[PDB]
Amino acid sequence: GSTQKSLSKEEIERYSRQMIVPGMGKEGQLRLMNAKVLIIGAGGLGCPAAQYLAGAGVGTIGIVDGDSVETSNLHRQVAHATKRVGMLKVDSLITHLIEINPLPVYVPYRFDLTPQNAAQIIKPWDVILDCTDNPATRYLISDVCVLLGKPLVSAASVQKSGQLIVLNCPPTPQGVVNKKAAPCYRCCFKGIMGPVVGMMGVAQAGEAIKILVSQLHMPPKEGEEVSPEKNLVQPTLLIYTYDLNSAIGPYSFRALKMGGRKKDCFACGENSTLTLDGIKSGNPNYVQF
Amino acid sequence: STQKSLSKEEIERYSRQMIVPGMGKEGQLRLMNAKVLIIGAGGLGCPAAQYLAGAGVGTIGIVDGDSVETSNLHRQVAHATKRVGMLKVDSLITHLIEINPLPVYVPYRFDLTPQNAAQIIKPWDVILDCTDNPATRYLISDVCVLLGKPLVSAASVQKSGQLIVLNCPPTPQGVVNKKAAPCYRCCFKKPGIMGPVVGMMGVAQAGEAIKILVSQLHMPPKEGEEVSPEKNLVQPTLLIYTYDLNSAIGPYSFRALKMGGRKKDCFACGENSTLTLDGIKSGNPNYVGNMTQSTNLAPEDRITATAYNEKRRNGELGEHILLDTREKEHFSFGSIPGAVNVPFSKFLVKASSIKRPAELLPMQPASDEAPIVVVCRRGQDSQEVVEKLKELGLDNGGKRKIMDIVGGMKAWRDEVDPDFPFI
Ligand SMILES: [Zn+2]
Ligand SMILES: [Zn+2]
């Protein structure tokens, strides 16, 4: 699955328009096709992210969700259909992804992600996208990504706005603080309109593609630092504010620069006591926020 | 004909969208009574239509004459592999019906041309330019100016895409005696693709269309009043999304440039314009890359708490004045060092009293180029302050920048000084 060294005749035609982009090419396309991307959440954030990773040809796409399609969510979950109401979101979404592009392998997880199964779900994947829109789950996914060394693309709905940030990319082992390292979600922190959540989801796919094509999740050359222009060690917190009574303004998008890994972070900092065994056993406890 | 109430089925489908502040039943009925035209059923048109269909726009028109091809599915995610060979408009409506069967979908199984542009556009309320074609983009803007239509235009290229709201609220051709929104010529005088880039701009197009309909941003202001500058209509924003495969989201990935209003000498909307609907039909404007540099970027009107502090720490803002418009007792709890307090309450009264000497509202100045920075509690009233100061010619014809701090003193606390004593 990750061993492709050639493109078939159908793949050349299907991906011809995007391979010609500078910085993509054949090497860029094979990196997508040999990649494994996990999408946690098949709703407003997960549907647009999945659609554009499917069209682009990511070779393996996992989707985690245990909920069902509902009529009142179609205005924002546009990958679903009215006739698929009552069906599992993961199955309804993959039905549309297969329509877009049947060449990738789609791996459904037909159940909720929890502290007891997070590590099992996340471990096999190269890049993690948090599309849960659940604050408690966000901390769980960040923690597990730190412990299993995974880059995390996390987005959320908050008030009348959306958010996006790339975390732990390139991943750095827990507790290492004698070098520049990317932050985790804890390092940074402590009714929704369709276009808002849709824009963050599309942005999430754009970032996952960036990481895989340019190998932004790979370490730098020995003794070399990660270029600050890559916006990885100190990532940007993107905040898009959407107000129904005001057309797009000069600061509807805010790009807040984040700090690097904190030395005293509960999860990734020095002397961290967070462990995979603890998470499984309820330590820490992810209280509903 | 106008629908005035909701059924049980519509309340279910739209319940979680109507609770959004500013939407409600009134906002929903405005969408369901609206008619939106989407020209182009491809990379930009698919996401735009998906989210307008889901939101419940009552009537959605789609113009396209091309067919679905395998090589474009990577960015045209509303189409299906099984529907390769079908007309794009027929393929797209099939998907839109699946999302939401309640709207009325109107296909135009042909391409827009100078000969049919006016006929196609006239019946529709809001126009979305989802063509990635320069020639068609100029043609649509021209027709929208002549027919008095608001236009949401987008474009995409290898590394970037753009979005801008034009001629909203619409103002007749040739009117130059008042503030008026620009057209595409006012903004850009004539000289591969990644899915996420075009998808981003397409979703943003639907977002703007929804805002225009729900808040009736395309309706004129009250007689004698100008459109609120805070609505970003008469001087719209040019959004630019730069997608660099070798760099994650950065400070300039999303760049929003403020545009000037209508140009007095615009070929299409300016005074003494020779452009007419019959001239377009006759080929008199000959609509010969996809994205070009703008030609009416306006001077900046706002600054972030972060940027203002960044310049203050490096001593960049020389000779400037900092006006704190919070009320007296609020200013007494603390302020930015060097801020002069000019309460907003008294400011509005003194400004009301200059309907007679010159500019006593303000305090001791220096030069003609000395910037003025306004800051209030949370950036709600500071734009109005800046707007009236310019109304009284205190920008000296544009040589003196007058800005406000985005988010007021709350943003100052959140972005710069977390221990600031904010009330
Ligand atoms: Zn951390
Ligand atoms: Zn013009």
Residue numbers in the entry:
A (entry chain B): 2 to 191, 206 to 304
B (entry chain A): 3 to 193, 206 to 302, 306 to 373, 378 to 444
Task: Copy text verbatim from the article accompanying this structure deposition.
In eukaryotes, the ubiquitin‐related modifier 1 (Urm1) pathway is responsible for the synthesis of 2‐thiolated wobble uridine (U34). Uba4 is a two‐domain protein containing an adenylation domain (AD) and a rhodanese‐like domain (RHD), which are both essential for the dual function of Uba4 in sulfur transfer and ubiquitin‐like conjugation (Furukawa et al, 2000; Huang et al, 2008; Schmitz et al, 2008; Leidel et al, 2009; Noma et al, 2009). Uba4 activates the C‐terminus of Urm1 via an ATP‐dependent adenylation step, receives mobilized sulfur from the Nfs1/Tum1‐relay system by its RHD, and subsequently forms thiocarboxylated Urm1 (Urm1‐COSH; Leidel et al, 2009; Noma et al, 2009). We heterologously expressed and purified Uba4 from Chaetomium thermophilum (CtUba4), a thermophilic fungus harboring highly stable proteins, well‐suited for X‐ray crystallography and other in vitro approaches (Bock et al, 2014).
Interestingly, the structure reveals a homo‐dimeric complex of two protein units with an asymmetric positioning of the ADs and RHDs, which themselves form individual dimers. While the ADs and RHDs individually form C2‐symmetrical dimers, the structure is asymmetric since the two 2‐fold axes do not coincide. The individual ADs are formed by a continuous sheet of eight β‐strands surrounded by eight α‐helices and are highly similar to both MoeB, the prokaryotic ancestor of Uba4, and to ADs of UBL E1 enzymes (Cappadocia & Lima, 2018; Lake et al, 2001; Olsen et al, 2010). Like the AD, the RHD forms a dimer mediated by hydrogen bonds between active‐site loop residues Arg398, Arg399, and Glu405 occluding the active cysteines, which suggests that the RHDs are inhibited in the apo form of Uba4. Noteworthy, the RHD dimer mainly interacts with only one AD. One Uba4 dimer harbors two nucleotide‐binding sites, formed by conserved residues of both ADs (Gly45, Arg77, Lys90, Asp134 of one subunit and Arg18 of the second subunit) implying that AD homodimerization is essential for the adenylation of Urm1. Although Uba4 was crystallized in the absence of nucleotides, the highly conserved binding pocket enabled us to model an AMP molecule into the structure with high confidence. However, the function of this linker is undefined. We found that in one of the two Uba4 molecules, almost the entire linker adopts a stable conformation with a well‐defined electron density, while this is not the case for the second Uba4 molecule in the dimer. The structured linker closely interacts with the AD, and its residues, in particular Asn307 and Met308, are in close proximity to the ATP‐binding pocket, coinciding with the expected localization of the C‐terminus of Urm1 when bound to Uba4.
